[PDB]
Amino acid sequence: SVNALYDYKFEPKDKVENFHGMQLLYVYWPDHLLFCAPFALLVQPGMTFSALVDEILKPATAAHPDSAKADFLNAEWLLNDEPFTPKADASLKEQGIDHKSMLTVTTPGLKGMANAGY
C-alpha cells in the first residue's frame, strides 16, 4: 500500500469516462512478433465482433504475410486470459469485452516466420 503524508487516493487516469464514448481494447496475436506488442485499439462498445475483426483487426494485421490466410473469428480466442467464444453479431459490450480487456486470438497452423515467432 502507498505510504504518504495524507490519504493518498486518486481517480484512475484511464477511466472509461475519459475516452469520449469509446473503450480501449488490446489484441494479442501470438507468434506474430512482427508487431512487437499487443495492439491498443480505440473502439465502439456497440460495434459487433465481426465489425471489430473486419474494420479494425484485419487492417492492423495486414502487413503480416499470414493475415490473409488467417481467419480470426474462428480462430481460438481468450478474453482476459479466460477461454472465450465470440458472438459475431453481438456487440463487444453486450458480450463482456469491456474497457482495457485483452483478446488473445491464436490461429493455429499460422505460427509466423522462420520458426521464430515473427
Binding site: K13, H20, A37, P38, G117
Partner: protein, 494 residues
C-alpha cells in the same frame, strides 16, 4: 589535541547545525517518518566524502576551464565531422531527450532531500550531489549544442521529454522517485541508479563516444568521473547507514531494492538497444556489459550486503536471461514505430549482424536475424515496415509490452490485474509486483498511448500529434536513417 580528518570535517559541517528550541524538530523535518524508516542515531553518520566549499570550488573550476576549452575547440574545428557515421548521432538524440532531463530532475530531487534530511552530513552530501547534477545537466546542453546545429532530433529535448511516448519511460522513472519520500528517493537513485546500475548507463554512452569519434561527449564523460565517484560512495554509504540504523529498515530497504532494480533495469533497455545497434563501432555487447557491470560487480556488492540481511534483487535471474534478447527486442520495436520518434532507425549492416551472431550465439540467428532478412526484403520492395497501430504500454515502466517469458523468447510475458473495478496490464511479474504494492500511485500514470486516444495530445491522428504536440518535424527528425536529411547532410560532408 588537534582534530582528526573526520572530526575536523564534522566541525566544518555537522557542528554548524543545532537542536532547535523555538520550533519542533518534526516541523523543521516533516518527511522522515511516513515511509516507515527509523533512524536511531544520526551522529553515527559517516561522511561519503569530505570536500569543504573552498576545495569543491577549486577543483570544479579547474575541471570546467579544461572542459569548455575543449568544447570550444571541438565546435571551432567542426569536430562533429570526425565521428564514425551520422547514424551514431541517434544515440545523442536519445541521450539529450531521455537522459539529460534526468540529470536536471536529479538536481531538483537532491536539492529537496538536501533540505529534508535531519542529519546535517546527509544534507551537505545531498546538496553537493544536487549542484553536480546541475553541472551535468548544463554541460550536456553545451556538449550537445554544436551537434544540435548540424543534425536533427536534438532541438526540443525537454519539450519532448514531457510528451513523446517512449520518453515517458525515463520521465516516469524519475517522477516515481521524486514523488516518493526521501529515503526511497535515496535508495532508488543514489543506491540503485547511481551505484548499482550506473556503469550500464555511463559506460555505453561515454565509451560509445570514444569508439566513434565523438570528442565532445567523451570529454564530458571523463570530466564527470570524479563526480560520479562521489555519488557512488554516497549511494553505498547511505544504504549501509539506513540498514544499520534499525532491524525494521531492512524489509523496507529490501522491498525498495527489488523495486528500483526492476525499474532501473527496464529504463536501461533503451541503453542496450543504443549500444548494440546505434553505435556504428561497437564497444561491447549489451550482454557482456550486463554480465560484468551487473552479474559480477552486482554479485560482489550483494555478497557484501548479505551481512545486513539483504538478498539480491527479485527477478534478477529474469534480467540476467533477458540480456540475450533485450537490444533486439527494442530495436525492432523502435524500428516499426519511428514514424513517431525524434531519431532514426535502420537495418543493421551485414558485418553488424555478424558481430551480433557472435555476441548472441544462442539467440540472434535463431530469433532476430530472420527479422532483418524479412524487413530488408520488404524495404527493397518499397514497403519499409511502419506499424500504424499503437502498442499496449506497461502500467508501471510504460514500455510497450514487448518482453518475453524466460526460456520462451516467443511468448510475451504479459500480465493483467483488476484493481478497484479497473483493468491494468504489465510487461512482466516485475512490474506487476510493483503495481500491487502501490496501486494508488500507478493508476495516476500519464500513459502516452492512452492520452493520445483521450484526445489530450493535440491531434486526432498520430502524424498530427507527432508534428504539432511532439514538435518532431515529419520527414526530418522522423523515419529510417535511409533517405533522411541527416544521411544526405553526411554523404555530402564526406
Amino acid at each position: 589535541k588537534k582534530l582528526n580528518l573526520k572530526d575536523k570535517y564534522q566541525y566544518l559541517t555537522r557542528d554548524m547545525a543545532w537542536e532547535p528550541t523555538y520550533q519542533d524538530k518534526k516541523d523543521i523535518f516533516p518527511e522522515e517518518d511516513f515511509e516507515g524508516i527509523k533512524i536511531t542515531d544520526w551522529s553515527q553518520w559517516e561522511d561519503p566524502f569530505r570536500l569543504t566549499m573552498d576545495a569543491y570550488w577549486k577543483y570544479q573550476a579547474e575541471k570546467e576551464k579544461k572542459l569548455y576549452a575543449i568544447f570550444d575547440a571541438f565546435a571551432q574545428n567542426n569536430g562533429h565531422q570526425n565521428i564514425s557515421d551520422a547514424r551514431y548521432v541517434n544515440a545523442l538524440k536519445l541521450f539529450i531527450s531521455g537522459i539529460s532531463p534526468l540529470e536536471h530532475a536529479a538536481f531538483q530531487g537532491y536539492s529537496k532531500v538536501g533540505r529534508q534530511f535531519s542529519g546535517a552530513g546527509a544534507r551537505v552530501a545531498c546538496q553537493m550531489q544536487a549542484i553536480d547534477e546541475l553541472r551535468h545537466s548544463q554541460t550536456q546542453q553545451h556538449a550537445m549544442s554544436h551537434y544540435n546545429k548540424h543534425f536533427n532530433g536534438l532541438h526540443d529535448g525537454p519539450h519532448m521529454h514531457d510528451r513523446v511516448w517512449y520518453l515517458s519511460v525515463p520521465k516516469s522513472f524519475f517522477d516515481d522517485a521524486r514523488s516518493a519520500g526521501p529515503f526511497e528517493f535515496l535508495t532508488a537513485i543514489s543506491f540503485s541508479f547511481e551505484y548499482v546500475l550506473t556503469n550500464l548507463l555511463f559506460v555505453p554512452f561515454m565509451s560509445g563516444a570514444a569508439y566513434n569519434g565523438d570528442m565532445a561527449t567523451v570529454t564530458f564523460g571523463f570530466s564527470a568521473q570524479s563526480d560520479e565517484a562521489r555519488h557512488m560512495t554516497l549511494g553505498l554509504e547511505v544504504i549501509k547507514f539506513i540498514l544499520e540504523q534499525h532491524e525494521d529498515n531492512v524489509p523496507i530497504v529490501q522491498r525498495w531494492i527489488d523495486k528500483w532494480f526492476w525499474r532501473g533495469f527496464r529504463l536501461l533497455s533503451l541503453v542496450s538497444m543504443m549500444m548494440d545497434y546505434m553505435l556504428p563501432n561497437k564497444v561491447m555487447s549489451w550482454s557482456e556489459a550486463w554480465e560484468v557491470y551487473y552479474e559480477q560487480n552486482g554479485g560482489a556488492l550483494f555478497k557484501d550486503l548479505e551481512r545486513y540481511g539483504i538478498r539480491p534483487p527479485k527477478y534478477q535471474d529474469v534480467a540476467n536471461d533477458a540480456k540475450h534478447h533485450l537490444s533486439h527486442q527494442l530495436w525492432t520495436t523502435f524500428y516499426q514505430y519511428c514514424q513517431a520518434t525524434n531519431f532514426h532507425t535502420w537495418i543493421p549492416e551485414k558485418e553488424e549482424m555478424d558481430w551480433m551472431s557472435e555476441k548472441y550465439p544462442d539467440t540472434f540467428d535463431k530469433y532476430y536475424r530472420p527479422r532483418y532478412e524479412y524487413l530488408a526484403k520488404e524495404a527493397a520492395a518499397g514497403r519499409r515496415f511502419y506499424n500504424n497501430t499503437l502498442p499496449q504500454l506497461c502500467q508501471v515502466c510504460q514500455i510497450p509490452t514487448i518482453f518475453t517469458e524466460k526460456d520462451a523468447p516467443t511468448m510475451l510475458s504479459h500480465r493483467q490485474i483488476e484493481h478497484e473495478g479497473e483493468r491494468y496490464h504489465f510487461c512482466s511479474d516485475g512490474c506487476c509486483d510493483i503495481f500491487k504494492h502501490e496501486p494508488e500511485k500507478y493508476i495516476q500514470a500519464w500513459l502516452p498511448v492512452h492520452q493520445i486516444y483521450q484526445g489530450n495530445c493535440e491531434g486526432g491522428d498520430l502524424e498530427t500529434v507527432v508534428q504539432k504536440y511532439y514538435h518532431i518535424n515529419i520527414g526530418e527528425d522522423n523515419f529510417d536513417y535511409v533517405g533522411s536529411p541527416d544521411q544526405k547532410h553526411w554523404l555530402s560532408i564526406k
